């Protein structure tokens, strides 16, 4: 029994051990309550504005579209406190936890941006935060690990499974089942069991709402397309939601193509995987013929997840949204291009979305198109990775 | 087949609790796994609960996480697990064999086909760890169409609506995890209840039976013994046998 | 002959070789023109809003003032594109350069934030940017060096003198004297020869203007004091300017105390140096008895400059502004405190201002006071430095 | 004293250009510096321009930047420079001695006191590199009160208002850096003009004199020679002498 529909067509659901079902039901009820509560909404708005800095800019990028009939805007989630869109929904989830009377936070992270967002929200709001992170990630994300710890978070390394994001995801769920009377699980994407895909969308939807208002103000019409990268699906659905009913507006999600789809080393389950059940949801997975969950791959840690949120799988299935892939090399070029020609250093995750928009422009340069790319984060965290590549490839 | 019902009938006529151990199929290898399992049965196991190694076992603590690692390290696959199950049933016609599965392994090549294969090799029940009763319909349907008992967990945070659902939907036995639970389950004509809550000593089995449960499941203590004796296959079996005998002793009274 | 007064009382002036005087006169005229030009103002406003993200948040910090009668707000220049206040005035200076028909930019940097701001502004606006940086700084600021280069800037190492910021400052001036027909010198603080102290103030004054409007909105009155760190003086004067004529509002500048004033290893010339002539201005200097310019010291690279802009020296002299110092250890504590209790990682420069406000609160905890700290930048660049210290001191 | 005026009068009566070299005081050490300077004079230097090592020489390129390093490396201080100047004047009563200073070193212990010390040791002029005419009032006042000529630079980007100011304010000689400049300077009764624009060969001196300048200043080429011959103090002097003689030859015609 639920208050809201746990499914998007065939995809979604609540595929957790029975023990976790009261936790999910509790959270759903608290969310439904909160959404009707003007006091909660005011509190959330206050934090978004005065703490996180919303609304974020919408920047027109003239240099990179010169000599074409593409007009390109970037939604500047890179400027949000914390340096990525992740901060929006953590503030709402942190308030939900408080509303539920919980005093502790669990959160998974790989790259680290969600972990940092979870830690900063916990520091501000007086919650005790533990972050589960595959040991492999801990090893590679010393910076983010230290930011979290500076902010008073406990980072717990995960050695189980393949010791990465998925296993980190698994670990967070395990902990929550036994601690959910005291702890809230602050899931960091629009995936996992209901009600998370719904909550995360609603607590990210201001991205698209602001974009719409900003593009009407500047251009007097809606965009032809809005384009976002897809790790688990939060930044994309945050951009898409307010446009779903605007049927003229294209919704384009960009999965990581890795070394190339044909290599099998990618993170593009929506278009190149098949439906399975994992992480509490029925969704496209990268899986072995036998039904074991595969390891994904992307140069971008934030996109390196072998599944995708169920709303995206649904929007694809009915043709409302289209999903494409962008390889490591394409993302890197888009990264360099934005630094050089607009003076903005984008997250390598966000660079995938940018690369697809640049492809739309370059492939058909006399096509009139008004595009918005969700620039989900800044790329300070990526400058070493990019440096090491450019140096190894000889530039 | 009626393996669970026949077992419970025999145990009820011998005023006797069930003792049921869990082991991971192929931990720490196929041949040793087969020998482990034969030792459990020879030492007094009333039934078996058998895990299939899975990439992402959400409901398992570190003990069984490592069991899976050990199995994967030996290259154990689901198909190999079904081969083993056939060999096990061929040796042991009456012992109830339940699987503990993750949903993706059941869903992978079609839910119906999974259950059909279970029936073909002589499995008696399937507990799918990450399918709550709320999501269970296609699993319990396929199970029943192929003469497999779908097993449901009754957790310590259960309510009355859940108790009716588990009672109605489950067969073979109810996987418990108190007297409110046990009596309501009986009131609702649920499959006989097995207590599975960190049972790791003979007293636990006794205490379970006394509370009005039909027996006890030792979901982890067995793999611990496997874990401690890796370097000594011979002693592994001796300790296994020792442990099971003790546990089984505690169920006769 | 000038259009505007080059002096603030005794301090300031135009102490450059004769050859540079036409460059300064040209720049002054272009600035006076631009300030009267609604088209220039619109362009500047556009970049500040839609590119840099202004207005910046004003965040009330409740946790760190609990149990006292201090109310503390932080002006969030840490959220500006680029991660510091430096971005504001570079956008205006870049437009001035264009207005003057210049196609190249020279800029000094030590820490690197100004260099990065100069590079990003140059990338956006199509200017060729070279950054002079003491070799010593290049060595220690690999990250910022790479950001600049990613953004297409040439970083030129300076080995002359002590191979640091001052010498970097010297180098930029040398280049400009010979290239000023083609190049604009984008000075990165409110110091150097007129008209730079004036231009930089006016192109940073939105900090204080926004603060005033924000504090009236939230509190219904002006602050008791506004507090800012002082490297060369830009962020502080940007915060102070709109409050100068509000005589009730305290203006508090915080110089780096280093290892302690009594050690001589600090960067606090306004209060502990003496007036000299260097870098084109008459201002307080750290200097030897003989009149050689001394090396300053601060844990914070951004504050490590042995002089200060002339407007600050003037505001001090007449008692309108008060200047204090904060040691390395005080700044570090303030850094840790803000991370832990508000979830904001401040620049170590900005941490000096925060530390002084925390001192005002703690020393007199029943004193009712409404304070604003200018949080001039975020402290991602400092996490290694802080890590190395905490590890070496054993935490 | 009237050292510049007397020099120009003698050179005008011998139809002769001035040649004036710059060196950094104490480069590469005090004793060697004193010997360097005596070599310049013995080889035909009409006057001297002498730098005092400073931490931050804004108007100097790398040649002289390194000269300062060399001096500091020898621990040369302004007080030591004034000691040297006294010894130089004591040996050479008539040669005009000008200093090239940075403002802070003049301002440090009081502007008046600096100029008073210059007069005491027998200096004839001071050019302050980072003081434009616009800021020059307290410097040119103190200079004149102590019988020191304040020297101003007339740059290649000068205008007519600047030419009148330099003409009016400067004494001893005008530091040039064309015929528009030279003739306007004379029209405005400026101190005699010395060309100082990268003059590094005898022809330059000739060309300067022909344009109507009173002579030429070699602001850098001398220190280059110091720089090239560090390892060989003996040869340093020979090359110095050689160079100065050539330069000086070019001024007789
Ligand atoms: C700037 C930026 N841009 C885009 C993305 C992609 O994530 P999306 O916007 O949710 O699709 C990330 C994702 N980053 C992760 C992964 N987070 C994550 C991904 C999948 C499952 C669980 C997770 O915690 C993190 O842990 O911070 C990001 O940081
Ligand atoms: C975040 C932040 N907060 C405060 C400061 C202090 O500078 P202020 O606000 O101008 O007083 C800095 C100064 N940083 C320098 C020094 N910049 C610099 C300093 C002195 C002379 C020339 C310079 O380029 C830079 O090169 O980026 C900073 O980055
Ligand atoms: Cl709402
Ligand atoms: Cl509402
Ligand atoms: Cl381009
Ligand atoms: Cl810490
Ligand atoms: Cl901890
Ligand atoms: Cl765990
Ligand atoms: Cl609306
Ligand atoms: Cl419009
Ligand atoms: Cl469209
Ligand atoms: Cl469409
Ligand atoms: Cl597939
Ligand atoms: Cl559609
Ligand atoms: Cl396309
Ligand atoms: Cl078109
Ligand atoms: Cl289980
Ligand atoms: Cl039943
Ligand atoms: Cl204006
Ligand atoms: Cl105007
Ligand atoms: Cl505190
Ligand atoms: Cl580069
Ligand atoms: Cl270059
Ligand atoms: Cl230079
Ligand atoms: Cl107003
Ligand atoms: Cl109010
Ligand atoms: Cl006050
Ligand atoms: Cl006051
Ligand atoms: Cl002093
Ligand atoms: Cl006053
Ligand atoms: Cl005080
Ligand atoms: Cl008070
Ligand atoms: Cl000079
Ligand atoms: Cl005269
Ligand atoms: Cs365009
Ligand atoms: Cs993905
Ligand atoms: Cs904003
Ligand atoms: Cs308070
Ligand atoms: Cs300073």
Taking Cα atoms as reference points, which of C271, C265, C323, C272 lies closest to residue C299? Answer: C265
Three-state DSSP state, C2:
coil
Taking Cα atoms as reference points, which of C359, C231, C372 lies closest to residue C297? Answer: C231
- Domains in chain A, ordered, with CATH? 8-48+86-200 (3.40.50.1100), 55-83+205-393 (3.40.50.1100)
Chain B residues touching residue A166 (CB < 8 angstroms): 56
Q: CB count, 10 Å around CB of A86?
A: 30
Asked if residue A152 lies in contact with residue A123, where contact means CB atoms within 8 angstroms, the answer is: yes
C-alpha dihedral, A278 to A280 to A282 to A286, nearest 10°: -20
Asked if D134 and C278 come within 8 Å (Cβ–Cβ), the reply is no
Question: Whole-angstrom Cα distance, residue A105 to residue A102?
Answer: 8
Chain C residues touching residue A333 (CB < 8 angstroms): none
Residue D49 a catalytic site member = yes
Asked if C60 and A81 come within 8 Å (Cβ–Cβ), the reply is no
Q: Beta strands A11-15 and B215-218: pairing type?
A: unpaired
Gyration radius (Cα) of chain C, Å: 20
Instruction: Render C235-253 in DSSP notation, one character per residue.
Output: HHHHHHGGGTT-TTSEEEE
Q: Give the ligand 2 atom nearest the CA of C109.
A: 26
Asked if B153 and A1 come within 8 Å (Cβ–Cβ), the reply is no
Probe site for chain C from D132, D137, D138, D164 (most C CB atoms < 10 A): D132
Q: CB count, 10 Å around CB of B39?
A: 17
Question: Whole-angstrom Cα distance, residue C251 to residue C236?
Answer: 9
Question: Whole-angstrom Cα distance, residue D102 to residue C162?
Answer: 17
C264: left (phi over 0), alpha (psi -120 to 50) or beta: left
Q: Give the ligand 2 atom nearest the CA of C235.
A: 9
Q: Establish if A187 touches chain B: CB-CB under 8 angstroms.
A: no
Beta strands in chain B, from DSSP E residues, in sequence order: 18-24, 48-51, 97-101, 125-128, 149-151, 153-154, 174-176, 193-195, 215-218
Q: Which ligand approaches the C-alpha of residue A197 most closely?
A: 1
Asked if D55 and C13 come within 8 Å (Cβ–Cβ), the reply is no
Structure-block tokens of residue B78: 């689901």
Q: Which residues pair with C275 in a beta bridge?
A: C284
Decide: residue B14, CB within 10 A, 0-12 exposed, 13-18 middle, 19+ buried: exposed
8-state DSSP, D193:
E
Question: Whole-angstrom Cα distance, residue A395 to residue B221?
Answer: 58
Q: Which ligand approaches the C-alpha of residue A373 most closely?
A: 1
Q: Which residues pair with A377 in a beta bridge?
A: A84
Structure-block tokens of residue D161: 């208002």
Q: Establish if A13 touches chain B: CB-CB under 8 angstroms.
A: yes
Asked if residue A274 lies in contact with residue B110, where contact means CB atoms within 8 angstroms, the answer is: no
Query: Which residue from D77, D105, D153 is facing C18, i.e. has the nearest CB?
Result: D153
Asked if residue D20 lies in contact with residue D217, where contact means CB atoms within 8 angstroms, the answer is: yes
The residue assigned the tokens 């200017």 is C127
Structure-block tokens of residue B20: 């049921």
Structure-block tokens of residue C111: 């820490």
Chain C residues touching residue A91 (CB < 8 angstroms): none
Structure-block tokens of residue A343: 């003076």
* Number of separate domains in chain B: 1
Q: CB count, 10 Å around CB of B18?
A: 27
C-alpha distances in Å from residue A69, one per residue of A103, A365, A368, C245, D207: 53, 6, 5, 50, 60
Taking Cα atoms as reference points, which of C192, C189, C199, C332 lies closest to residue C253? Answer: C189
For residue C343, the surrounding DSSP H or E stretch is none
Omega of the bond prior to A55 within 30 degrees of 0, cis?
yes
Probe site for chain D from C5, C15, C293 (most D CB atoms < 10 A): C15
Asked if D132 and C170 come within 8 Å (Cβ–Cβ), the reply is no
* Side-chain-facing half-sphere of D49: CA atoms under 13 Å: 28
Domain hosting residue D252, numbered range: 2-253
C-alpha distances in Å from residue D223, one per residue of A354, C259, D101: 56, 40, 17
8-state DSSP, A377:
B
Beta strands in chain C, from DSSP E residues, in sequence order: 7-8, 11-15, 58-60, 70-76, 104-108, 128-134, 154-158, 183-185, 225-229, 250-258, 274-278, 280-285, 321-327, 369-375
Asked if residue B174 lies in contact with residue B149, where contact means CB atoms within 8 angstroms, the answer is: no
Dihedral sign for Cα D133, D135, D137, D142, please: negative
Dihedrals φ, ψ of D49, to 5°? -120, 125
Measure the N-to-C terminal CA separation of chain B; round to a whole number of Å.
Answer: 28
Taking Cα atoms as reference points, which of D82, D81, D87, D12 lies closest to residue D46? Answer: D12
Interface of A with B in 268-307 (CB under 8 A): 276-280, 285, 287, 290-293
- In the set D16, D27, D46, D49, the catalytic residue is D49
Query: Cβ neighbours of residue B85 under 8 Å, at least 6 residues apart?
Result: B25, B50, B97, B99, B121, B122, B123
8-state DSSP, C263:
G
Q: Establish if C148 touches chain A: CB-CB under 8 angstroms.
A: no
Q: Establish if C178 touches chain D: CB-CB under 8 angstroms.
A: no
Question: Whole-angstrom Cα distance, residue D181 to residue D198?
Answer: 17
Asked if residue B23 lies in contact with residue B37, where contact means CB atoms within 8 angstroms, the answer is: yes
The residue assigned the tokens 């190149």 is A272
Question: Whole-angstrom Cα distance, residue A174 to residue D40?
Answer: 88
Query: Which residue from C50, C126, C342 is facing A123, i.e. has the nearest CB?
Result: C342
Which residues of B belong to the active site? 49, 60
Question: Whole-angstrom Cα distance, residue A105 to residue B24?
Answer: 33
Question: Whole-angstrom Cα distance, residue C133 to residue C135?
Answer: 6
For residue A245, the surrounding DSSP H or E stretch is none
Gyration radius (Cα) of chain D, Å: 17
Taking Cα atoms as reference points, which of C220, C226, C255 lies closest to residue C243? Answer: C226
Asked if residue A280 lies in contact with residue A166, where contact means CB atoms within 8 angstroms, the answer is: no
Structure-block tokens of residue A27: 């959270």
Question: Whole-angstrom Cα distance, residue B50 to residue A219?
Answer: 63
Question: Whole-angstrom Cα distance, residue A79 to residue A68?
Answer: 27
Q: Rounded to the nearest 5 degrees, what angle is found at the Cα of B95, between the Cα atoms of B93 and B96?
A: 115
Q: Which chains touch B (3 or more CB pairs under 8 A)?
A: A
Structure-block tokens of residue C44: 């500047």
Measure the N-to-C terminal CA separation of chain A; round to a whole number of Å.
Answer: 58
Structure-block tokens of residue B169: 């939907």
Question: Whole-angstrom Cα distance, residue A189 to residue A8?
Answer: 16
How near does any CA of chain C get to the CA of D53, in Å? 9
Omega of the bond prior to B28 within 30 degrees of 0, cis?
yes
Structure-block tokens of residue C54: 């202004």
Q: Do chains A and C touch (3 or more CB pairs under 8 A)?
A: yes
Asked if residue A119 lies in contact with residue A144, where contact means CB atoms within 8 angstroms, the answer is: no
Three-state DSSP state, B173:
coil
Q: Which residues pair with B151 in a beta bridge?
A: B127
Asked if B56 and A293 come within 8 Å (Cβ–Cβ), the reply is yes
Q: Establish if B114 touches chain A: CB-CB under 8 angstroms.
A: no
Three-state DSSP state, C373:
strand
Asked if residue C262 lies in contact with residue C325, where contact means CB atoms within 8 angstroms, the answer is: no
Give Cα D153 distance to the centre of its chain: 11
Size of interface A-C (CB pairs under 8 A): 105
Helices and strands, number each (H, E), in chain C? 15, 14
Omega of the bond prior to C55 within 30 degrees of 0, cis?
yes
Asked if residue C266 lies in contact with residue C257, where contact means CB atoms within 8 angstroms, the answer is: yes
Asked if residue C8 lies in contact with residue C193, where contact means CB atoms within 8 angstroms, the answer is: no
How near does any CA of chain C get to the CA of D162, in Å? 10
For residue A93, the surrounding DSSP H or E stretch is helix A86-99
Question: Whole-angstrom Cα distance, residue C238 to residue C292?
Answer: 30
Query: Cβ neighbours of residue A109 under 8 Å, at least 6 residues apart?
Result: A115, A116, A118, A131, A132, A133, A137, A144, A165, A168, A188
Beta strands in D34-169, from DSSP E residues, in sequence order: 48-51, 97-101, 125-128, 149-151, 153-154
Q: Establish if D135 touches chain C: CB-CB under 8 angstroms.
A: yes
Q: Residue B68's closest chain A neighbor by CA?
A: A161
How near does any CA of chain A get to the CA of C58, in Å? 6
Dihedrals φ, ψ of A39, to 5°? -65, -40
Q: Is the CB of A374 under 6 A from ligand 1?
A: no
Burial C213-241 (b: 16+ CB within 10 A, else e): ebbeeeeeebbbbbbbbbbbbbbbbbbbb
Q: Is the CB of A372 under 6 A from ligand 1?
A: no
Dihedral sign for Cα C77, C80, C86, C92, please: negative
Beta strands in D56-118, from DSSP E residues, in sequence order: 97-101
Question: Whole-angstrom Cα distance, residue B108 to residue D90?
Answer: 104
Asked if residue B42 lies in contact with residue A157, where contact means CB atoms within 8 angstroms, the answer is: no
For residue D148, the surrounding DSSP H or E stretch is none
Query: Which residue from D107, D157, D161 is facing C19, i.e. has the nearest CB?
Result: D157
Asked if residue A96 lies in contact with residue A34, where contact means CB atoms within 8 angstroms, the answer is: yes
Interface of B with A in 45-84 (CB under 8 A): 54-59, 61-62, 65, 77-79
Q: Establish if A50 touches chain C: CB-CB under 8 angstroms.
A: yes
Q: CB count, 10 Å around CB of A383?
A: 18
Q: Which chains touch C (3 or more CB pairs under 8 A)?
A: A, D
Q: Beta strands A274-278 and A280-285: pairing type?
A: antiparallel
Beta strands in chain D, from DSSP E residues, in sequence order: 18-24, 48-51, 97-101, 125-128, 149-151, 153-154, 174-176, 193-195, 215-218
Q: Which chains touch D (3 or more CB pairs under 8 A)?
A: C
C394: left (phi over 0), alpha (psi -120 to 50) or beta: left
- Of A83, A232, A268, A385, the residue with max ligand 1 atoms within 8 A of its CB, to mutate for a pocket test, comes to A232
Q: Is the CB of A253 under 6 A from ligand 1?
A: no
Asked if residue A133 lies in contact with residue A157, where contact means CB atoms within 8 angstroms, the answer is: yes
CATH number at residue B39: 3.20.20.70
* Side-chain-facing half-sphere of A180: CA atoms under 13 Å: 18
Asked if residue C360 lies in contact with residue C369, where contact means CB atoms within 8 angstroms, the answer is: yes
């Amino acid at each position: 029994t639920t208050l809201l529909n746990p499914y998007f067509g065939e995809f979604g659901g609540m595929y957790v051990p029975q023990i976790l079902m009261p936790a999910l039901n509790q959270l759903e009820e608290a969310f439904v309550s909160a959404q009707k509560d003007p006091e909660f909404q005011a509190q959330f708005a206050d934090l978004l504005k005065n703490y996180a800095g919303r609304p974020t800019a919408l920047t027109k990028c003239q240099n990179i579209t010169a000599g074409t009939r593409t007009t390109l805007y970037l939604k500047r989630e890179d400027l949000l406190h914390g340096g990525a869109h992740k901060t929006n929904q953590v503030l709402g989830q942190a308030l939900l936890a408080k509303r539920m009377g919980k005093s502790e936070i669990i959160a998974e992270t790989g790259a680290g941006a969600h972990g940092v967002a979870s830690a900063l929200a916990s520091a501000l709001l007086g919650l005790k935060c533990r972050i589960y992170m595959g040991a492999k990630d801990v090893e590679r994300q010393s910076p983010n690990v230290f930011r979290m710890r500076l902010m008073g978070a406990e980072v717990i390394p995960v050695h189980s499974g393949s010791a990465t994001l998925k296993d980190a995801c698994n670990e967070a769920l395990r902990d929550w089942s036994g601690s959910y009377e005291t702890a809230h699980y602050m899931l960091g994407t629009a995936a996992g069991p209901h009600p998370y895909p719904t909550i995360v969308r609603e607590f990210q939807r201001m991205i698209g709402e602001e974009t719409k208002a900003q593009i009407l103000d500047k251009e007097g019409r809606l965009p032809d397309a809005v384009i976002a990268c897809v790790g688990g699906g939060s930044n994309a659905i945050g951009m898409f939601a307010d446009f779903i009913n605007d049927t003229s507006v294209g919704l384009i999600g960009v999965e990581p193509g890795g070394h190339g789809i044909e290599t099998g080393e990618h993170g593009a389950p929506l278009k190149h995987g098949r439906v399975g059940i994992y992480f509490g949801m029925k969704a496209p997975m990268m899986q072995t013929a036998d039904g074991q969950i595969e390891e994904s791959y992307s140069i971008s840690a934030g996109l390196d997840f072998p599944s995708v949120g169920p709303q995206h799988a649904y929007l694809n299935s009915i043709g409302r949204a289209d999903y494409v892939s962008i390889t490591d090399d394409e993302a890197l070029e888009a990264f360099k291009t934005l630094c050089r020609h607009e003076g903005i250093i984008p997250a390598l995750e966000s660079s995938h979305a940018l690369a697809h928009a640049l492809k739309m422009m370059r492939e058909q340069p006399e096509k009139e198109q008004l595009l918005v790319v969700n620039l989900s984060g800044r790329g300070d965290k990526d400058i070493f990775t990019v440096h090491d590549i450019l140096k190894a490839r000889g530039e | 087949m009626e393996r669970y019902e026949n077992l419970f009938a025999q145990l009820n006529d011998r005023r006797e609790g069930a003792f049921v151990p869990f082991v991971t199929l192929g931990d720490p290898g196929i041949e040793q796994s087969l020998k482990i399992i034969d030792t459990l049965i020879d030492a007094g196991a009333d039934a078996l609960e058998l895990g299939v190694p899975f990439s992402d076992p959400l409901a398992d603590g570190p003990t069984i996480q490592n069991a899976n690692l050990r199995a994967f390290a030996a290259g154990v696959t689901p198909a190999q697990c079904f081969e083993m199950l056939a060999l096990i049933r061929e040796k042991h016609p009456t012992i109830p064999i339940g699987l503990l599965m993750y949903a993706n392994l059941v869903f992978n090549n079609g839910i119906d086909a999974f259950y059909a294969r279970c029936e073909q090799v002589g499995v008696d029940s399937v507990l799918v760890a990450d399918v709550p009763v709320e999501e269970s319909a296609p699993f319990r349907q396929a199970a029943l169409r192929h003469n497999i008992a779908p097993i449901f967990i009754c957790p310590p945070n259960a309510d009355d609506d859940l108790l009716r659902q588990v009672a109605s939907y489950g067969r073979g036995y109810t996987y418990l995890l108190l007297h409110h639970l046990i009596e309501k389950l009986k009131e609702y004509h649920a499959a006989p209840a097995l207590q599975g809550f960190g049972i790791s000593s003979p007293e636990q089995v006794s205490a379970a039976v006394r509370a009005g449960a039909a027996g006890a499941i030792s979901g982890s203590a067995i793999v611990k013994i496997i874990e401690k004796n890796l370097a000594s296959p011979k002693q592994m079996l001796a300790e296994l046998r020792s442990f099971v005998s003790a546990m089984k002793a505690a169920s006769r009274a």
